[PDB]
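Example 3.
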Amino acid sequence: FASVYAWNRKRISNCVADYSVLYNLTFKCYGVSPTKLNDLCFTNV
Amino acid sequence: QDSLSSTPSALGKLQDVVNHNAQALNTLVKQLSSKFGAISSVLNDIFSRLDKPEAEVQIDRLITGRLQSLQTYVTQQLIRAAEIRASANLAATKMSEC
Amino acid sequence: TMYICGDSTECSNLLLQYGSFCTQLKRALTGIAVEQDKNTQEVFAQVKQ
Amino acid sequence: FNGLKGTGVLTESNKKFLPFQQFGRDIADTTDAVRDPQTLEILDITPCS
Amino acid sequence: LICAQKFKGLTVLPPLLTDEMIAQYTSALLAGTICSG
């Protein structure tokens, strides 16, 4: 992992977002519910 | 015919009745786009993005604002109706006496 | 009910908790509508012949 | 449609969407037209009778 | 715009007396006024 002073950004696009694994394994969502991410679409992540 | 034809304002008294009611309905529709502090004016996404108890809060704002709009519309219609009733009564009097 | 909640079933149910506001609004508009026809007949329908 | 949810009748649209536009809205800021994500056909959305 | 309002639950109700019926009342009044004062 990158240092906090030099945080690293990875782009996610053109894919199917399966969030079950993240639930399966701190998890706070703002403006969105963690149990409804399975049925949303985004222009970028 | 010449007096009426060449004077667009001659029938303003009747055109205003049409315009006032048409505007009232268009205003009532436009108010739907207002959020009243809510995150969205669209109920369906508020349900899709937020959880149950969270969506309920955002919706209560929208319901309250929209109930306030409908009540305003009706109040103004009652006031306008009173004015038109008086005019109709005058017209009926003139029909009898003139 | 349509004006406020559209096609949302959940909103339609939440709206039922806000009282009789909708009943009052519907009878106010109904009363006006009837009056408008009364006004017309008072002015024009002054002949039985 | 791509996350957008609602009830209504889907018909063929005559609205010439620009190559980059995905949806349109009415005077109340409510979607009344969408681009189909697979066929790119434009559809109009109206309330059911 | 009538449909835009119809799709928001705002509608318009017809009059009981149509324009033709109000024309008939007017014609009756005129016929009376001229021929019998």
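Chains A and C do not touch (no CB pair under 8 Å). The helical segments of chain A are 20-24.
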